[PDB]
PDB file of C-alpha atoms in Angstrom:
ATOM      1  CA  UNK A   1       7.413   7.416   1.654  1.00 49.75           C
ATOM      2  CA  UNK A   2       3.766   7.156   0.609  1.00 49.62           C
ATOM      3  CA  UNK A   3       1.378   4.455  -0.604  1.00 51.97           C
ATOM      4  CA  UNK A   4      -1.538   5.157  -2.984  1.00 51.59           C
ATOM      5  CA  UNK A   5      -4.618   3.135  -3.951  1.00 50.98           C
ATOM      6  CA  UNK A   6      -7.800   3.185  -6.004  1.00 52.42           C
ATOM      7  CA  UNK A   7     -10.988   1.127  -5.387  1.00 48.50           C
ATOM      8  CA  UNK A   8     -11.226  -0.585  -8.850  1.00 49.59           C
ATOM      9  CA  UNK A   9     -10.557  -1.896 -11.403  1.00 49.71           C
ATOM     10  CA  UNK A  10      -6.893  -0.903 -11.155  1.00 47.26           C
ATOM     11  CA  UNK A  11      -5.571   2.620 -10.584  1.00 50.49           C
ATOM     12  CA  UNK A  12      -8.436   4.293 -12.491  1.00 50.34           C
ATOM     13  CA  UNK A  13     -10.954   5.662  -9.943  1.00 49.68           C
ATOM     14  CA  UNK A  14     -10.991   6.539  -6.162  1.00 48.10           C
ATOM     15  CA  UNK A  15      -7.928   8.374  -4.783  1.00 47.66           C
ATOM     16  CA  UNK A  16      -6.777   7.485  -1.250  1.00 50.21           C
ATOM     17  CA  UNK A  17      -3.225   7.393   0.185  1.00 49.63           C
ATOM     18  CA  UNK A  18      -1.401   5.974   3.225  1.00 50.67           C
ATOM     19  CA  UNK A  19       1.914   7.759   3.988  1.00 50.36           C
ATOM     20  CA  UNK A  20       1.812   7.990   7.817  1.00 52.98           C
ATOM     21  CA  UNK A  21       4.468   6.032   9.754  1.00 50.84           C
ATOM     22  CA  UNK A  22       3.518   2.557  11.041  1.00 50.83           C
ATOM     23  CA  UNK A  23       0.641   0.911   9.107  1.00 52.39           C
ATOM     24  CA  UNK A  24      -2.950   1.419   7.916  1.00 50.22           C
ATOM     25  CA  UNK A  25      -5.696  -0.990   6.760  1.00 50.31           C
ATOM     26  CA  UNK A  26      -6.552  -0.340   3.089  1.00 48.20           C
ATOM     27  CA  UNK A  27     -10.113  -0.911   1.800  1.00 48.52           C
ATOM     28  CA  UNK A  28      -9.576   0.363  -1.775  1.00 49.40           C
ATOM     29  CA  UNK A  29      -9.835  -2.887  -3.764  1.00 48.37           C
ATOM     30  CA  UNK A  30      -8.425  -1.500  -7.060  1.00 45.59           C
ATOM     31  CA  UNK A  31      -4.884  -0.311  -7.859  1.00 47.26           C
ATOM     32  CA  UNK A  32      -1.823  -0.065  -5.595  1.00 47.36           C
ATOM     33  CA  UNK A  33       1.014   2.402  -6.105  1.00 45.77           C
ATOM     34  CA  UNK A  34       4.014   3.250  -3.922  1.00 45.62           C
ATOM     35  CA  UNK A  35       6.710   5.951  -3.762  1.00 44.24           C
ATOM     36  CA  UNK A  36       9.957   5.260  -1.898  1.00 40.42           C
ATOM     37  CA  UNK A  37      12.146   8.080  -0.497  1.00 38.27           C
ATOM     38  CA  UNK A  38      14.406   6.742   2.232  1.00 39.26           C
ATOM     39  CA  UNK A  39      11.414   5.044   3.918  1.00 41.50           C
ATOM     40  CA  UNK A  40      10.869   1.365   3.143  1.00 42.83           C
ATOM     41  CA  UNK A  41       7.420  -0.279   3.116  1.00 43.49           C
ATOM     42  CA  UNK A  42       5.887  -3.764   3.226  1.00 43.99           C
ATOM     43  CA  UNK A  43       2.366  -5.187   2.945  1.00 44.95           C
ATOM     44  CA  UNK A  44       0.508  -7.150   5.547  1.00 44.90           C
ATOM     45  CA  UNK A  45      -2.234  -9.609   4.532  1.00 46.10           C
ATOM     46  CA  UNK A  46      -3.935  -8.687   7.826  1.00 45.13           C
ATOM     47  CA  UNK A  47      -5.253  -5.211   8.702  1.00 45.90           C
ATOM     48  CA  UNK A  48      -3.168  -2.903  10.927  1.00 45.58           C
ATOM     49  CA  UNK A  49      -0.102  -5.068  10.104  1.00 45.43           C
ATOM     50  CA  UNK A  50      -1.209  -7.494  12.830  1.00 43.65           C
ATOM     51  CA  UNK A  51       0.871 -10.297  11.289  1.00 43.08           C
ATOM     52  CA  UNK A  52       3.976 -10.858   9.135  1.00 42.66           C
ATOM     53  CA  UNK A  53       4.888  -8.933   5.958  1.00 41.44           C
ATOM     54  CA  UNK A  54       4.516 -10.273   2.392  1.00 41.53           C
ATOM     55  CA  UNK A  55       5.521  -7.790  -0.354  1.00 41.50           C
ATOM     56  CA  UNK A  56       8.236  -5.212   0.411  1.00 41.27           C
ATOM     57  CA  UNK A  57       9.311  -2.176  -1.683  1.00 42.02           C
ATOM     58  CA  UNK A  58      12.488  -0.077  -2.016  1.00 39.94           C
ATOM     59  CA  UNK A  59      11.459   2.097  -5.006  1.00 39.23           C
ATOM     60  CA  UNK A  60       8.189   3.699  -6.225  1.00 39.72           C
ATOM     61  CA  UNK A  61       5.972   0.815  -7.402  1.00 39.26           C
ATOM     62  CA  UNK A  62       2.935   2.129  -9.309  1.00 40.44           C
ATOM     63  CA  UNK A  63       0.983  -1.141  -9.700  1.00 38.31           C
ATOM     64  CA  UNK A  64      -2.712  -1.275 -10.709  1.00 36.40           C
ATOM     65  CA  UNK A  65      -3.330  -4.995 -10.146  1.00 35.31           C
ATOM     66  CA  UNK A  66      -6.039  -6.460  -7.814  1.00 34.83           C
ATOM     67  CA  UNK A  67      -5.190  -6.550  -4.086  1.00 33.31           C
ATOM     68  CA  UNK A  68      -3.071  -9.226  -2.384  1.00 34.65           C
ATOM     69  CA  UNK A  69      -2.896  -7.923   1.220  1.00 33.91           C
ATOM     70  CA  UNK A  70      -4.957  -5.773   3.652  1.00 37.05           C
ATOM     71  CA  UNK A  71      -2.684  -3.070   5.159  1.00 38.27           C
ATOM     72  CA  UNK A  72       0.500  -1.185   4.295  1.00 38.17           C
ATOM     73  CA  UNK A  73       3.351  -0.521   6.727  1.00 37.82           C
ATOM     74  CA  UNK A  74       5.926   2.226   6.085  1.00 35.10           C
ATOM     75  CA  UNK A  75       8.878   2.793   8.438  1.00 33.37           C
ATOM     76  CA  UNK A  76      10.132   6.286   9.347  1.00 31.48           C
TER      77      UNK A  76
END
């Protein structure tokens, strides 16, 4: 599975993704999309998932709201 994000306002600008296994600290403060495909994913309010999860996903979630976490973890 892969995560996608834009820097602002929502998902209408910069294009940067995070699909690699484990987690990655996002800096794009705009939109936040997701695409499930066997691999589950959850957000972490602290960079490099150095804490507990907050918002999990099981299906592609193409949101374009402001941020709410710092990094995205995706199992493999």
